[model samples]
Target: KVFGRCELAAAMKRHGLDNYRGYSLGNWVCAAKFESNFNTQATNRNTDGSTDYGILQINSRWWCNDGRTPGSRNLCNIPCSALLSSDITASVNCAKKIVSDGNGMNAWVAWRNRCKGTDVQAWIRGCRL
Candidate 1:
């Protein structure tokens, strides 16, 4: 599913992204916007043969089994395909794991480059969560 800004915010909030780490809900929303543009089916292939999957673009090298990444840790213990479904449950779960693994939100270059130190709340302005 391709979500509108508020729609994605609501969905992510329901899954418990709100300040999950010292990061705010707006941070998640901003990262999602730049990472996948709110598209559940989004995927990107990196130069190192690893693939980034789904909305938060969880990488296969550490989080999922894509059957292509040479040394996938599968830390999320999920198939990369799970992240691409219309239901974003797996994607959200993996994102939490990414942060919990001590990477914080910086694991995503999109968040570092686009969301960090910016007016993150503006990304979800007027949206009730």
Candidate 2:
């Protein structure tokens, strides 16, 4: 994982993610916390038979190609394995693209279920951003 809470705040700030697409840093941080516990290498298989990859848990159905899966849209044009790294640059870029495509953080179910309209200040509470 690249960050804990404070480190994530610093990295997010450095990457200009504090307010990207009108979403707050708290929302992003909260989403990451619930989605993968900030682990970049996280991956999960959904009941729908699609897999989620990386910190954002991007889906194989539309964003990446797992190779084994046929008919992958691969909209991000990146291999799923590329997202499973501590660097996080590719994952962050792809996440920006996903949000820009109008999904916003709602693309992440974790955000929709947990962070949306919730007070997420604690996600960065003790962090020095």
Candidate 3:
């Protein structure tokens, strides 16, 4: 399931990410755009052999239990497959956990590379938030 920016924006907003931890909805939207293009089923294997799952690209190495990542922390204590659903509740919750764990948005390299320090509001413009 591929979500448009506005749809993702509304979803994340409803999930309480609009202003979670000083990171705006736009920051999240931007990260989601770059990380997985808002595709619920997206998955990418990292160079270190862990896989990233879902719309926000939550990683198996730290956030999810994929049963494949050698050093999986599974800090989010969720099955990786749960993050890949269209519902996005698990993914959104894990994203908040990632930020709440003192990593901030920098936990995601895509956020650092594409969303950090920019006018991220561009990612949510004209949306009825």
Candidate 4:
């Protein structure tokens, strides 16, 4: 988790202009902590037996087997392993892409609230990276 977290921090350093003092960086960590307790191998089971796999609880079936091809995988179509990879920049960049669309951190904030058992909406406001 620390490796992945460091990779993510470096990625944010590259693309997240809003990130400083580890706010967004901490948010990523908080998100995973809330979602799966920082479990890189975490998987969520569905009632129908379908599953969301990996640290980010990514639904592997939706993205698996599609990103291994060179030039076919980038942030826009990043694979789950990218988050778990040793390449911190790739992992963080991948996460940034996931939240780049708009209102990306809303869900993360919500997760932080739920996971940490806090009512503080700005739970990660101090997590600038």
Q: In terms of lDDT, which candidate is strongest? A: 3
Question: Model 4, residue 50: displacement in angstroms?
Answer: 6.2
lDDT score of residue 109 within candidate 1: 99
Q: What overall lDDT, based on C-alpha atoms, would model 3 receive against the true structure?
A: 0.92
For model 2, the local distance difference test gives: 0.84
Taking the tens digit of each residue's C-alpha lDDT, what string does model 3 give over 25-55? 8999999999998899999988999999999
TM-score for each candidate, following the candidate numbering? 0.96, 0.92, 0.96, 0.49
Clashing pairs in 3: none
For model 3, the superposed segments whose C-alpha errors exceed 4 Å read none
Clashes of each: 0, 0, 0, 11
lDDT of 4 at 9: 40
| Poorest lDDT segment (10 consecutive residues) of candidate 3 | 99-108
- lDDT, each prediction: 0.91, 0.84, 0.92, 0.47
> Comparing candidate 1 with candidate 4, which one achieves the higher TM-score?
1
lDDT of 2 at 74: 90
Least lDDT summed over 10 consecutive residues: which range in candidate 2?
Answer: 1-10
After superposition, the stretches of candidate 1 with alpha carbons farther than 4 Å from their true spots are none
lDDT of each residue in 1-129, candidate 1, tens digit only: 898899898988999998898788999999999999999889999999999999999999989999999877999999999999988889999999898887799999999999999999997799876
